Design an enzyme around this catalytic site. Structure first.
Site, PDB file in Angstrom:
ATOM      1  N   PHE A   1      -8.397  -6.304   3.188  1.00  0.00           N
ATOM      2  CA  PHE A   1      -7.946  -4.911   3.329  1.00  0.00           C
ATOM      3  C   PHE A   1      -8.148  -4.146   2.016  1.00  0.00           C
ATOM      4  O   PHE A   1      -8.632  -3.005   2.015  1.00  0.00           O
ATOM      5  CB  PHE A   1      -6.471  -4.891   3.758  1.00  0.00           C
TER       6      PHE A   1
ATOM      7  N   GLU B   1       0.789  -1.235   0.000  1.00  0.00           N
ATOM      8  CA  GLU B   1       0.000   0.000   0.000  1.00  0.00           C
ATOM      9  C   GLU B   1       0.819   1.283   0.000  1.00  0.00           C
ATOM     10  O   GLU B   1       0.300   2.330  -0.360  1.00  0.00           O
ATOM     11  CB  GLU B   1      -0.945   0.029   1.203  1.00  0.00           C
TER      12      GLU B   1
ATOM     13  N   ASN C   1      -7.461 -20.063  -9.964  1.00  0.00           N
ATOM     14  CA  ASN C   1      -8.799 -19.499  -9.900  1.00  0.00           C
ATOM     15  C   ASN C   1      -8.796 -18.041  -9.437  1.00  0.00           C
ATOM     16  O   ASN C   1      -9.558 -17.224  -9.947  1.00  0.00           O
ATOM     17  CB  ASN C   1      -9.665 -20.347  -8.970  1.00  0.00           C
TER      18      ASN C   1
ATOM     19  N   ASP D   1      -6.319   6.409  -5.050  1.00  0.00           N
ATOM     20  CA  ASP D   1      -5.835   5.039  -5.102  1.00  0.00           C
ATOM     21  C   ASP D   1      -5.936   4.495  -6.525  1.00  0.00           C
ATOM     22  O   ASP D   1      -6.221   5.251  -7.462  1.00  0.00           O
ATOM     23  CB  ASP D   1      -6.582   4.144  -4.090  1.00  0.00           C
TER      24      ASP D   1
ATOM     25  N   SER E   1     -12.766 -19.870  -5.273  1.00  0.00           N
ATOM     26  CA  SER E   1     -11.403 -19.755  -4.754  1.00  0.00           C
ATOM     27  C   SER E   1     -11.336 -20.143  -3.284  1.00  0.00           C
ATOM     28  O   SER E   1     -10.411 -20.842  -2.856  1.00  0.00           O
ATOM     29  CB  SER E   1     -10.875 -18.333  -4.905  1.00  0.00           C
TER      30      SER E   1
ATOM     31  N   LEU F   1      -8.670   4.163   2.731  1.00  0.00           N
ATOM     32  CA  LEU F   1      -9.717   4.720   1.882  1.00  0.00           C
ATOM     33  C   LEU F   1     -10.556   5.731   2.655  1.00  0.00           C
ATOM     34  O   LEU F   1     -11.029   5.450   3.759  1.00  0.00           O
ATOM     35  CB  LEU F   1     -10.611   3.604   1.343  1.00  0.00           C
TER      36      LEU F   1
END
Length: 162
Positions: free
Chosen positions: A104, A11, A132, A20, A117, A32
């Protein structure tokens, strides 16, 4: 390596409001602020989050505070989610970090939707899960980060972050 260092790598750290990868106002270590196109709205969220009038700039300590809250939130989101908790509980600590990383970035509801998945991860079919996971908007829009997270799921090692 741990989930905090992993997400710091993925990040970054920026002390002024930035957009972002999706064009959304953000600050710190991937915190965010809002999906609103209004910078004023983003500034209001920031002041509320920090508890002072920031004018769009925060300190490193303040950024790390939001980050700790956001990691905490990702984990509690996983544990309160009926789809994510059994997967999380089934995983080793390294692969748990990969799941936290996804939550996150995309949110609990988003990751909870990766039904096939998640099943492959629960079954510990690691190579299949990895294949996947990559068939996703996530992978296509952020491939280098998704590749690191997927490698972490595939191997149960921190190889992609060293």
């Amino acid at each position: 390596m741990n989930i905090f260092e992993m997400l710091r790598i993925d990040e970054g750290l920026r002390l002024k409001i930035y957009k972002d990868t999706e064009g959304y106002y953000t600050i710190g270590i991937g915190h965010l602020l809002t999906k609103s196109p209004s910078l004023n709205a983003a500034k209001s969220e920031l002041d509320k989050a920090i508890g002072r009038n920031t004018n769009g700039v925060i300190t490193k300590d303040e950024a790390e505070k939001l980050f700790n809250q956001d990691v905490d939130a990702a984990v509690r989101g996983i544990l309160r989610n009926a789809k994510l908790k059994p997967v999380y509980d089934s995983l080793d600590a390294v692969r748990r970090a990969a799941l936290i990383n996804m939550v996150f970035q995309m949110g609990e509801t988003g990751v909870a939707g990766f039904t096939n998945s998640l099943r492959m991860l629960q079954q510990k079919r690691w190579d299949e899960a990895a294949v996947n996971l990559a068939k996703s908007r996530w992978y296509n829009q952020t491939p280098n980060r998704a590749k690191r997270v997927i490698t972490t799921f595939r191997t149960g090692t921190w190889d992609a972050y060293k």
